[PDB]
């Protein structure tokens, strides 16, 4: 049902297993139920989890899709995480 994604600084993110499988890298890391991310800090991983919910909600939807927001200060690190996770 749920999986645990742990950031470099020890924050634990509990997300729906299906939402987390949106990432091919995560699927591979799972096949606990727990994945440790040595290079992904919590301010980046929290945004990755928001992306999963956003993607699962807005994919194959006729509703007006809002912009996914990214603060400039997080952009570089989030790009590195998205690249690794194939998100």
């Amino acid at each position: 049902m749920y999986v645990k994604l742990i950031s470099s600084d020890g924050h634990e993110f509990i997300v729906k297993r299906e939402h987390a499988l949106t990432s091919g890298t995560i699927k591979a890391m799972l096949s606990t139920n727990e994945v440790n991310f040595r290079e992904i800090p919590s301010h980046v991983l929290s945004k990755v989890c928001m992306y999963f919910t956003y993607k699962v909600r807005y994919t194959n939807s006729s509703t007006e899709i809002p912009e996914f927001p990214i603060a400039p200060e997080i952009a570089l690190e989030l790009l590195m995480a998205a690249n690794f996770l194939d998100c």
Partner: protein, 138 residues
């Protein structure tokens, strides 16, 4: 290969910008050449005269990021009264969304000064382009 059909059959259309971007409507001419049309500010609409079998695509006017029209890439006006062209943001991948944000903040000359992997510098320089999207598209 991807071109408008010279039907000469008028078709009134409403370009409806349901996105937060400035929209660039692009008509594919009889030779398949992309032809830009006047831009649409966010949230606005335009009643335009087009023709049956004509091909349109929509891009962000400033960055050329691809947009959706009636949930697909291409819009073909059909038989009428006016046809609605509902322009929206796609659900971009997280990586593409990050590339868009980084491109909006960093001058292309300065991409090589960012502390990232070489492969990401190449992804940053590989800007969205209508020509690349058209070829192909097969």
């Amino acid at each position: 290969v991807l071109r408008s059909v010279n039907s000469r059959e008028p078709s009134q259309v409403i370009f409806c910008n349901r996105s937060p971007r400035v929209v660039l409507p692009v008509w594919l001419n009889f030779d398949g050449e992309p032809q830009p049309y006047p831009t649409l500010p966010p949230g606005t609409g335009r009643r335009i005269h087009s023709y049956r079998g004509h091909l349109w695509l929509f891009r962000d006017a400033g960055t050329h990021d691809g947009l959706l029209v009636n949930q697909t890439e291409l819009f073909v006006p059909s038989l009428n009264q006016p046809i609605f062209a509902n322009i929206t943001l796609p659900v971009y991948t997280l990586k593409e969304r990050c590339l868009q944000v980084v491109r909006s903040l960093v001058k292309p000359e300065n991409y090589r000064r960012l502390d990232i992997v070489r492969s990401l510098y190449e992804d940053l320089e590989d800007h969205p382009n209508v020509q690349k999207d058209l070829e192909r598209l097969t």
